[PDB]
């Protein structure tokens, strides 16, 4: 049964509810990024109306074979009638095709659901600041104090120079990234830029990047390995074990592995600045942990809720216990008293 927090009051709809069968009243279900959490239960058997971004849409096609009378995309920054309900989906910086969702109910309130999010000042000039909003349906996942790190650009920055001093020293040594999921593609492509190489990759990931409209993708990805000097391995496989034996498969092209593993928050945060970052090393092999987030930190968070000064707050992460929901409810009173809303 679909908890209370996935169902927008005085609509038809349920945004990211695909995992339990078919929701009694629902006659559209919202789709927020094509995340697994997020999109578990669809597949080539749905029959029902699918909305969503252009890009979610052509993974929700290709990926998953969900048949193509079903999906719905939507333009971004355009308002749209749904079912009788003016919308809009504004971008979620996240991953490819992430949105947010602006509901304008008929009554008079308005909802704005982030799905998942990191936020940022430039949503304060987004078709946000022309409106109040009443109910804000909040991507909490680091809710708390302790949840600090680095920009996006200064993580890259990181592992651009970090690679190109390693390959410049060592022209064979060979850069390894980790992934499980679209987002923080980022990563790979910076350093691929910087060493004048493509990425090479699995047929399903190359598959998968070929849906995202990223501009001039042809020129930056591949399924030749022996190629490339930049691969792609899936995140499971970034560990000495797994990294020795790919080391092997490339005939002894390559005598040296420099690896990545872009985690969100790791506690490392609370002590180390990202200049003073240092990998773990056995023998030829180095992996290097980098905090790459694609969710808001606790400070980016609480200054958006400050800007917003909704009426209410749901949280939709860290839900399921008492300490967690006590914890985000704290903050809420905090924020609302200082700001004064
Ligand atoms: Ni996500």
């Known amino acids: 049964t679909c908890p209370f927090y996935k169902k927008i009051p005085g ?8 995992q339990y069968g078919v929701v009694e009243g629902c006659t559209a279900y919202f789709l927020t990024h094509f995340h697994s959490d997020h999109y578990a239960g ?28 079903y999906i719905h995309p939507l333009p971004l920054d355009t308002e749209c009638i749904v079912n009788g309900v003016k919308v ?25 659901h982030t799905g998942d999010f990191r936020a940022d000042p430039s949503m304060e000039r987004s078709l ?23 920009s996006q650009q200064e993580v890259i920055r990181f592992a651009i ?30 350093i691929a830029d910087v060493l004048g190489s493509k990425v090479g990759m699995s047929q399903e990931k190359y598959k998968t990047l070929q849906c995202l409209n990223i501009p001039e993708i042809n ?42 593993r872009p985690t969100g928050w790791t506690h490392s945060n609370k002590f180390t600045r990202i200049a003073d ?3 773990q090393t056995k023998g030829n092999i180095s992996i290097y942990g980098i905090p790459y987030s694609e969710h808001s930190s606790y400070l980016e968070m609480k200054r958006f809720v400050q800007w917003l000064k909704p009426q209410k707050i749901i949280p939709t992460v860290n839900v399921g216990t008492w300490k967690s929901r006590s914890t985000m409810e704290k903050y809420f009173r905090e924020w609302k008293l200082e700001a004064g809303y």
């Open 11 to 18: 609509t038809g709809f349920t945004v990211d509810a695909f």
């Open 42 to 69: 669809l597949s080539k058997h749905f029959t029902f109306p699918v909305y969503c971004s252009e890009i979610t849409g052509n993974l929700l096609k290709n990926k998953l074979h969900v048949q193509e009378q």
């Open 88 to 112: 809009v989906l504004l971008d979620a910086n996240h991953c490819p095709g992430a949105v947010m969702i602006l509901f304008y109910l008929p009554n008079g309130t308005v909802i704005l």
């Open 128 to 150: 946000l600041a022309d409106q109040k909003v009443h109910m804000l349906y909040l991507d909490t996942t680091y809710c708390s104090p302790e949840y600090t790190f680095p």
């Open 161 to 190: 120079n970090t690679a190109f001093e390693a390959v410049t020293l060592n022209p064979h040594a060979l850069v390894v990234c980790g992934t499980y999921s679209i987002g923080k593609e980022k990563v790979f492509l910076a």
């Open 219 to 260: 020129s930056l990805i591949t399924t030749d390995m022996c190629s490339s000097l930049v691969h792609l391995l899936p995140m499971m496989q970034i560990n000495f074990k797994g990294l020795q034996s790919h080391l092997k498969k490339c005939g002894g092209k390559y005598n040296q592995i420099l690896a990545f």
């Open 277 to 279: 970052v240092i990998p």
